[PDB]
Amino acid sequence: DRPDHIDSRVWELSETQEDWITQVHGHVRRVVECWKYTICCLISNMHTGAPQYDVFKWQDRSTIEWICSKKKVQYPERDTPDLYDNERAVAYKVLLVSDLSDHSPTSGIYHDLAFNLEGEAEESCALVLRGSQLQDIKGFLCRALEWVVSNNLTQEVVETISGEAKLQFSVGTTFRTLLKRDTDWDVIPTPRVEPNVPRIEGRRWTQMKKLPLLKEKEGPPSPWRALLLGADSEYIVCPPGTDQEAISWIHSQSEIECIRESKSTPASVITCLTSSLQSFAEGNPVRSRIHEDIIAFGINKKQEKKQSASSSASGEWKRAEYQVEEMSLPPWVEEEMVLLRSDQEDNWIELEKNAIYTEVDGVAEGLVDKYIEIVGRTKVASVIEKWQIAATRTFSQLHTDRSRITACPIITRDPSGNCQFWGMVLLGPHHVKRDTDNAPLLIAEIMGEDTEEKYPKHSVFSLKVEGKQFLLSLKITSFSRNKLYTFSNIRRVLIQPASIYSQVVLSRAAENNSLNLEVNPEIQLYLEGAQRGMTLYQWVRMILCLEFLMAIYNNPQMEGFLANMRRLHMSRHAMMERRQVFLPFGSRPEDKVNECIINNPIVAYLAKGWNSMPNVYY
């Protein structure tokens, strides 16, 4: 009959303090008055040696007169106060209102202590009181509100502690006419239909007995289409020095002649490179426009194509439809995967270690060190460094409109200090107005091997530096600023394989209840058939290479394919555990996957890998 947070003596006194049945609220009035008196009792319970305060309400006027005479105060009969601190000789009334902030002064005779319904108080009142009593009041009011909501008395309590509300919104007549123009119901919808949930004859759920196969597309093999090269990236070793010195050394000793010419990148464009290199050797990365630049960066090509199109304006307008050219898994993806995990004589992931203060810190640093040692000396790490440096140097030159050719060399440095010239990136005359605009680039890179079917649009020249021979591939690209910024920190690709490695190591540690940061067990995989698994280190290296390729070839096709392959990955996991997979009517997840297999060579590689795995589990 009473809340669990209400005592007996206070309850009985509140029930007998007034005639509550003659008022509008017969129950909540008693409850709120008892709450106020319980707050008074709790605040007065504490002491300094004398009690902090003392209860005044709900007592005869004799004690009121005695206190007034002694404690230097006067208390009228209309609105008797409830609390009075003698240490400060100040009278406070602990009233609770829904308005946390709005506390209009009912009277100016004495200070008023208004409290929030949820426990809070005024802006400049709780400071005078200590902390523990504030927490007690907060908890009591929270429990009070909990009981109120439990017994569906929110509106009644709000009325009790706030008088009555008012209609704070009203809608006119013409506005109602506007609102009721496109719906069969009025502003307050009252469909004269009995509520009822009917029964509909559905379709049965079919079981997925065997995993689906993904469609493999046919057509020309997909050529390499990344911004820069992958495993076929090399560098020229130059004496230690600044970028200008290295470029001058390269320019002085260089005999460049075309080996293979591509129609997309005419050999004449080589003049744009050397002329740039020379300029960069003199200390001016920005260079004046020359004739070849027109072909190199498509200067005025917009108007040229506009005229070449208007020349064929004799026709009829048709709804412009687009066709994406389907292509098959090119054979160079497997070769790229093999070459990306080849060893290197140097470690290409040199990140400063964090500080160690705790055992957890030591374990984390050990795991990171082991991971870096595992994947640090691979071709993929060097390619990642090359990509990051090239992207950073190219993106740093796209913050201002420029009508001149810029030089952005790709030069790293070995620990001994020798410069490593991976290539060059010439930035054409750009006017960056939108962050997604495509800046024109002429990218020259040092290759290890040339394949016409893999680099159809690259022009390959020979480059002789002090006897040594190199291949220099030139490509006329147009790349978005956003993608350049994204690749500026391509180093994040190291996180996912690190996640896998750390999870495996920690699982082994938990199983053995003793961390061993040098364990590389055999991971069983669905490989060709010659072998039945790999070591943990080799698997981590392969994962890093594949993830790098996925990041480099990330486009809408890749995003859709990966998003829709998680369902099938989960289905395969369920089947591996002899669970059952059931599907709704007319369900075909393989269709969702197949919608995203068009051009992306890496997506085709992943689809082929999926197809090679068993599609039935017994």
Partner: protein
């Protein structure tokens, strides 16, 4: 892909984080969005009738239909009025304490809401300048227009803003004095069209989809009602176990994963997403659900009108078509608005209003998320469905615990049918039921037995924010710590991310190699003492939350003289972020 399918040590669920390419550049949407917008607008009408009859469906005001017209084999666009009423009543009766909390919000929190919070939204299409502007300037312009046309001082409370809107709408005509004094006129119909016009835009950087999809934003005249309804929806959703709102997802998913019978029953885990989720809902169902809730709550009448107004305006909406459909004449290319030339969307030509198209059915993504989630959740309430359910807007996971497989399949089909009943279609190809339960996916969190991997949708940008060295270091360490304690990165990956961010942060402030800053510090013998100066990092995995200066002082890496020089407030270089002020807290010019 077989490389991503372990058969030992770990499982394919563990390697689910490998099926992500967020480390690569997210795709962007190019050129005109008219095709996507028109497809979104036409999808609802093609699904209203089992036999696609768009023309017959263009006259339906309230998308209500009988259960005989609901397509159980393909997407359905309408809703059942009686089913909506009964399901809303059941939802009210089940989560009654949530209704009480909502009533407390309505009777206490709602009146005090301040319209200034309206200035924290997407860019708004001002109905005067006819060009998109940031939210605060648009709010100021709208308020000034209201005050000028009403001759009153609109109160700070949000209800005053809404009442001011409802009052200006009664005016036969309105005028705005520009400020540069230029007058602008408005007829009641013109202002009504401006208020009910949603401006569309490409959803950029959206990963995980092959096709680009658009989103819509409302006017500033109706954003107050939208905010009221969305706040009410949030308040109700925070107090129900079936919601996927940003609540303690770890606790929720773990609790549902642990659920099991006495090992004799049949358990199933259905993971799925809704197809055409926004392109099938009807605002009439949403407002009817809200009206049922309010009426059962004993709320006053003006409250119900206030809650219904935004959905009424959305029903009579006007979607901006963008720039036009692309056409080619030989080798040219020209954008033309719908209507001039034949196209697949010719059925909608009758709905064209200027450059905006009128549509009563369907909805646009990014406008009513919480209301859509509430509509989805009310469907789950009925005697047949006795399993658990979690819904995050378009994603959902259901846990069936039945006596036999037949009951489980019946409950699954009943769930699908009820969702169709309220206007929500589960994508059949994206819905997978595993039996026995234990493996599932939801909201990019993958559950296996008793392990939930919270796979991050995006990697943290492990680069300095660009404010200043100290602030950037603090923010980056905080981001890494947050991503760690949410399960998105374990200790090794957290330390690796710390190292990567450290390298990027040192590079951005010219401290890694031979630069002007390092050359200056070497010539004048300024020993590097801070992280941005090139000193070795002082933070660790365990100390990702501490401040660099205090940590260095405690460890003895900073001396009282250096601290006094650094922390001198009289230096001319002075400007949750808890980085103490210092000479290294400068502000960049541009």
């Amino acid at each position: 892909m077989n490389l991503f399918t372990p058969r030992s040590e770990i499982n394919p669920t563990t390697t689910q984080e490998l099926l992500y390419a967020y480390t690569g550049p997210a795709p962007v949407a190019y050129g005109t969005r008219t095709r996507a917008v028109l497809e979104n607008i036409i999808r609802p009408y093609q699904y209203f009738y089992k036999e696609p009859n768009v023309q017959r469906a263009l006259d339906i005001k309230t998308g209500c239909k009988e259960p005989e017209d609901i397509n159980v084999e393909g997407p359905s666009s309408g809703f059942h009025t009686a089913s909506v009423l009964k399901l809303a009543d059941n939802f009210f009766r089940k989560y009654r304490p949530a209704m009480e909390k909502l009533k407390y919000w309505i009777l206490v929190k709602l009146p005090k809401l301040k319209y200034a919070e309206l200035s924290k939204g997407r860019q708004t299409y001002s109905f005067i300048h006819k060009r998109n502007l940031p939210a605060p300037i648009a709010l100021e312009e709208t308020v000034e227009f209201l005050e000028q046309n009403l001759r009153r001082k609109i109160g700070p409370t949000l209800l005053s803003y809404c009442q001011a809107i409802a009052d200006v709408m009664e005016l036969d005509e309105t005028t705005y004095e520009g400020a540069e004094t230029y007058t602008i006129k408005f007829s009641r119909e013109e202002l009504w069209d401006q208020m009910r016009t949603l401006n569309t835009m490409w959803k950029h950087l959206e990963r995980g989809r092959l096709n680009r999809r658009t989103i819509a934003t409302p006017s500033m005249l109706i954003r107050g009602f939208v905010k009221i309804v969305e706040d009410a929806a949030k308040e109700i959703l925070e107090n129900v176990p079936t919601s996927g709102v940003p609540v303690g997802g770890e606790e929720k998913l773990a609790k549902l994963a642990s659920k099991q019978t006495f090992h004799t029953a049949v358990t199933g885990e259905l993971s799925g997403d809704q197809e055409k989720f926004n392109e099938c809902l009807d605002p009439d169902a949403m407002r009817l659900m809200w009206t049922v809730f309010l009426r059962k709550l004993g709320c006053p009448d003006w409250i119900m009108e206030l809650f219904n107004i935004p959905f009424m305006v959305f029903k009579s909406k006007l979607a901006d078509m963008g720039e036009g459909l692309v056409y080619t004449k030989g080798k040219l290319t020209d954008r033309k608005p719908l209507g001039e030339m034949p196209s697949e969307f010719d059925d909608l030509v009758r709905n064209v209003v200027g450059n905006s198209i009128s549509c009563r059915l369907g909805m646009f993504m990014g406008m009513y998320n919480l209301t859509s989630t509430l509509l989805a959740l009310i469907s789950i309430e009925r005697e047949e469905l006795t399993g658990s359910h979690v819904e995050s807007s378009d994603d959902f996971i259901h846990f069936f615990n039945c006596k036999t497989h037949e009951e489980m399949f019946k409950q699954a089909e009943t769930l699908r049918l009820t969702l169709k009943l309220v206007g929500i279609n589960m994508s059949p190809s994206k819905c997978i039921l595993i039996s026995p339960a234990g493996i599932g996916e939801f909201n990019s969190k993958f559950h296996h037995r008793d392990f939930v991997g919270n796979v991050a949708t995006e990697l943290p940008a492990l680069v300095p924010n660009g404010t200043n060295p100290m602030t950037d270091l603090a923010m980056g360490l905080n981001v890494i710590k947050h991503s760690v304690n949410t399960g998105q990165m374990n200790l090794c990956t957290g330390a690796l991310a710390m190292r990567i961010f450290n390298h990027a942060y040192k590079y951005a402030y010219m401290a890694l190699g031979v630069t002007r800053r390092t050359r200056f510090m070497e010539e004048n013998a300024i020993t590097p003492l801070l992280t941005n100066q090139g000193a070795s990092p002082v933070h660790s995995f365990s100390t990702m939350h501490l401040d660099e200066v205090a940590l260095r002082r405690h460890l003895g890496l900073l001396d009282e003289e250096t601290l006094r020089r650094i922390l001198n407030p009289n230096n001319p270089v002075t400007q949750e972020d808890y980085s103490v002020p210092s000479c290294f807290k400068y502000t960049l010019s541009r």
